[PDB]
Amino acid sequence: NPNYCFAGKTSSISDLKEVPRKNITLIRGLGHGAFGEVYEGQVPLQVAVKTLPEVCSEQDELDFLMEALIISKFNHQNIVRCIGVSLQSLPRFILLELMAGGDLKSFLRETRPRPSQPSSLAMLDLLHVARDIACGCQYLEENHFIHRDIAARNCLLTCPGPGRVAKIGDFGMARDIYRGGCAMLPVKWMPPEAFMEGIFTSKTDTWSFGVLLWEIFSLGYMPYPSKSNQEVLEFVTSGGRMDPPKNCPGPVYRIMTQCWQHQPEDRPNFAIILERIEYCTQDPDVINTALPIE
């Protein structure tokens, strides 16, 4: 059984909390898409259940074990909790905090203000989501963990309603690297030194967070509209940057452009990003700005 080290502490599969299979009940599917299905479950404690296909390779098995180790060793309010695992019966389960709000990309798209729902979302809701994820990112940064795929699709919401809390919910890219192809690399979220030299640092996630910020304030649009992966690669490498999302306040767009500085040394760390998000949330001219109604 492979070892995992986080914050200089070493853990093993034996450290995972094995929940007896009999204590676990599947309720409904939440989707499969990527390798494996996800179900809502009960252990009563309500959970999301990530499953490993019984028809898988040994590498799929190792990948599954590693993501279990990675998530269980985090302890922060803006990272999804692992309730435990069921690895001793098949198919194997990882048990996660149930985030009833679903993933952030789907949420933004579904919760866009509309003539039917004219006040579904406000600038403050978006700033709160941004702060939440930035807090999670700061925790990773201070513990020297590089996420490598900070993106709306990988964030989750505790609930649809106003008290929602956003958390980082998927660590599959970091898992792969820790141990694929060009076409699968999240190039639209990556800085120049990442896709060119394969150099990753904390400032890798800063750049990606800027793209997430654009996703958030665009209300769920795909980054670099109308651009392919290679077109984005050449655009960004040549200094090109995304325009502000529709109705985006200047102070918010300015955080994006700072996250996208070419030199990683010129990009803010997450402490600074959090400070700027805070300042935006205080600014009436920012939060009084109306989001577009489709």
Ligand X SMILES: Cc1nn(C)c2c1-c1cnc(N)c(c1)O[C@H](C)c1cc(F)ccc1C(=O)N(C)C2
Q: Which two tokens stand for residue 160?
A: 């649809």
Residue closest to ligand X, measured at CB: 169
Identified catalytic residue from 103, 132, 149, 205? 149
Q: Which of 16, 19, 24, 48 binds ligand X (CB under 6 A)?
A: 48
Residue 262 among known ligand-binding residues: no
Binding residues among 223-252 for ligand X as defined by CB under 6 A: none
The secondary structure of 83-106 as a DSSP string is EEEE-SSSS-EEEEE--TTEEHHH
Q: Please, what is the minimum distance in Å from the beta carbon of residue 6 to ligand X?
A: 18
50 interacts with ligand X by CB under 6 A: yes
Q: Omega of the bond prior to 91 within 30 degrees of 0, cis? A: yes
Are 208 and 136 in contact by the 8 Å Cβ rule? The answer is no
- Residue 292 φ then ψ, to 5°: -65, 145
149 is catalytic: yes
Ramachandran area for residue 33 (φ above 0: left; ψ -120 to 50: alpha; else beta): left
Torsion, Cα of 161, 147, 222, 108 (10° steps): 0
Distance in angstroms (rounded) separating the CA atoms of residues 69 and 15: 8
Residue 97 among known ligand-binding residues: yes
Q: Which of 138, 154, 206, 208 binds ligand X (CB under 6 A)?
A: 154
Q: Which of 41, 84, 136, 169 binds ligand X (CB under 6 A)?
A: 169
281 interacts with ligand X by CB under 6 A: no
Residue 99 among known ligand-binding residues: yes
Residue 48 or 52: the one with the smaller Cβ distance to ligand X is: 48
Q: Which of 67, 103, 205, 215 binds ligand X (CB under 6 A)?
A: 103
Angle between helices 123-142 and 270-282 (to 10 degrees): 160
Q: Please, what is the minimum distance in Å from the beta carbon of residue 139 to ligand X?
A: 16
Q: Which of 208, 211, 231, 237 is nearest to 222 (CA)?
A: 211
Instruction: Map tokens 């900070």 to a residue.
Output: 150
Binding region for ligand X (CB under 6 A) out of 95-103, 116-124, 218-226, 280-288: 95-103
- Residue 32 φ then ψ, to 5°: -120, -65
Q: Please, what is the minimum distance in Å from the beta carbon of residue 106 to ligand X?
A: 6
Q: For the chain, what is the radius of gyration of the CA atoms?
A: 19
124 interacts with ligand X by CB under 6 A: no
218 interacts with ligand X by CB under 6 A: no
205 interacts with ligand X by CB under 6 A: no
User: Residues interacting with ligand X, by CB under 6 A?
Assistant: 30-31, 38, 48, 50, 80, 96-100, 102-103, 106, 154, 156, 169-170
Active site (catalytic) residues = 149
